Amino acid sequence: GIRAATSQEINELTYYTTLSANSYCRTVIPGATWDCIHCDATEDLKIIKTWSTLIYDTNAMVARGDSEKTIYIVFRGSSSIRNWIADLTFVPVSYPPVSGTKVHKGFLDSYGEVQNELVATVLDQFKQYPSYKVAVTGHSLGGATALLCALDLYQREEGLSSSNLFLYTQGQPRVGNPAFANYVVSTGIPYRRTVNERDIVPHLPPAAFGFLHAGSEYWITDNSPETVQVCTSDLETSDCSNSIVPFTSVLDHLSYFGINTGLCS
């Protein structure tokens, strides 16, 4: 390219895713460880470281592984887531590195813160380781951161690259633118891314514114088994896732594969 993846790849991726887832947881972161559951796977690884931161917171870581090786880184893412896514825113720125580218710122710131430390650680580781690878991764935111871281690483460069580194892532867313892516691719690294498926874261932112893315892618678618686817490429595319758218777822996010892522668971 596308393818597927493988297985491985797936495984790886798952592982890564786881780681892323683981881271877241716391323990691981931171714691760281591983513980947881898953862781284981890773554981092983180681860781190282971681961271957381414060311101932104961122967381992461690283680881490583070884074985594987690787290283790783992671891242985571946131915591818471848902818321973151728811718230876231873116721113863118630128870145830185590169230139142109751118891325956114926140892432860157976261890463830155851691880175540194881481890277450183890584590187350281790587360185230680280197070888290883690284890876890265983461997832979300983681992835873105892771991517840135890776780138840174690569750149730184160291070493790382691509290869190793890787890345992965897962878812893532885217861151840136394209340118850145490319750158891343370139670097390459690888890456992967893843896413788961648906996810938513890846886618863121837216495419438319611118931113884218790258890486690759893966896616897953488925678971079972598972598946894845892847695419590859890297860057972114469419294819795957884216495718568916718118538708877417847230848951897826967281877781891846299955695982848871863021928571851891």
CA-angle at 16, arms to 167 and 70, nearest 5°: 70
d(CA 56, CA 66): 32
Question: Whole-angstrom Cα distance, residue 139 to residue 16?
Answer: 10
Q: Which residues are catalytic?
A: 140, 199, 253
Q: Experimentally, how was this structure solved?
A: X-ray
CB 199 within 8 A of CB 140: no
Q: How far is it, in rounded angstroms, from Cα 103 to Cα 175?
A: 5
* Residue 253 · residue 199 · CB < 8 Å: yes
Determine whether the annotation assigns residue 57 to a binding site.
no
Q: Is 253 exposed, middle or buried (0-12, 13-18, 19+ CB in 10 A)?
A: exposed
Residue located via tokens 């790382």: 160
Question: In units of Å, what resolution does this entry have?
Answer: 1.9
Residue with the two structure tokens 């957381």:
52
Asked whether the beta carbons of 253 and 140 are under 8 A apart, the reply is yes
Task: Spell out the residues 6+ positions from residue 253 whose beta carbon is closer than 8 angstroms to its own.
Answer: 140, 199
